Amino acid sequence: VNSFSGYLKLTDNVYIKNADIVEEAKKVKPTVVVNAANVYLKHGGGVAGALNKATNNAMQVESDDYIATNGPLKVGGSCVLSGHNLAKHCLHVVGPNVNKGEDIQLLKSAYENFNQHEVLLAPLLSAGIFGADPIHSLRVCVDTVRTNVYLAVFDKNLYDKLVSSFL
Numbered sequence: 001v002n003s004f005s006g007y008l009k010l011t012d013n014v015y016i017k018n019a020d021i022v023e024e025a026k027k028v029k030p031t032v033v034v035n036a037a038n039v040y041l042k043h044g045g046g047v048a049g050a051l052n053k054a055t056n057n058a059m060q061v062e063s064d065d066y067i068a069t070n071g072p073l074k075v076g077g078s079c080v081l082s083g084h085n086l087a088k089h090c091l092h093v094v095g096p097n098v099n100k101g102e103d104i105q106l107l108k109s110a111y112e113n114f115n116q117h118e119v120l121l122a123p124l125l126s127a128g129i130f131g132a133d134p135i136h137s138l139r140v141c142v143d144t145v146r147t148n149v150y151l152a153v154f155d156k157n158l159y160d161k162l163v164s165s166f167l
């Protein structure tokens with residue numbers, strides 16, 4: 001039993017809700033919140049900009065030190081950093097950005113990072129400003145993630161389409 005509330009159950013392990021991931025994280029304080037990161041951990045917009053803003057830029061400060069030490073992530077890769085005031089940990093995961101021409105096949109590799117964590121609050125990877133089809137992202141999530149994932153989402157209209165079209 002966990003403290004996630006109001007989610008629709010899609011499969012044994014995947015749950016979904018129309019919600020603002022910032023507000024969800026602040027309420028639940030999950031062990032792991034997933035950020036929709038880029039390889040430079042530059043948290044400008046979308047989920048990343050919103051999460052970073054909620055940390056008063058502490059996420060960006062920590063991220064800049066991470067990059068200075070380790071260099072950029074790989075598309076499809078991830079790193080674990082602090083969750084600041086939002087969660088114990090933040091798993092920064094880089095899905096392919098279609099608006100940069102990146103290979104959508106890398107979306108499965110991106111979701112594989114979730115399997116290293118028993119429970120996660122997460123957005124749909126590569127959706128929103130990353131330019132992928134969210135119906136596809138949800139399908140890849142369900143077919144790749146085996147741990148317990150709580151998908152937040154932001155767009156109410158999009159949520160209804162994802163539910164009604166789910167196979």
Ligand SMILES: OC[C@H](CC1CC1)Nc1ncnc2[nH]ccc12
Nearest residue numbers: 021046047050123124127128154
């Ligand atoms: O595919 C991720 C999704 C995509 C379209 C809704 C823009 N973005 C978000 N999902 C959940 N919470 C969020 N908070 C801020 C942004 C955000």
Ligand SMILES: [Cl-]
Nearest residue numbers: 046047128129
């Ligand atoms: Cl977005």
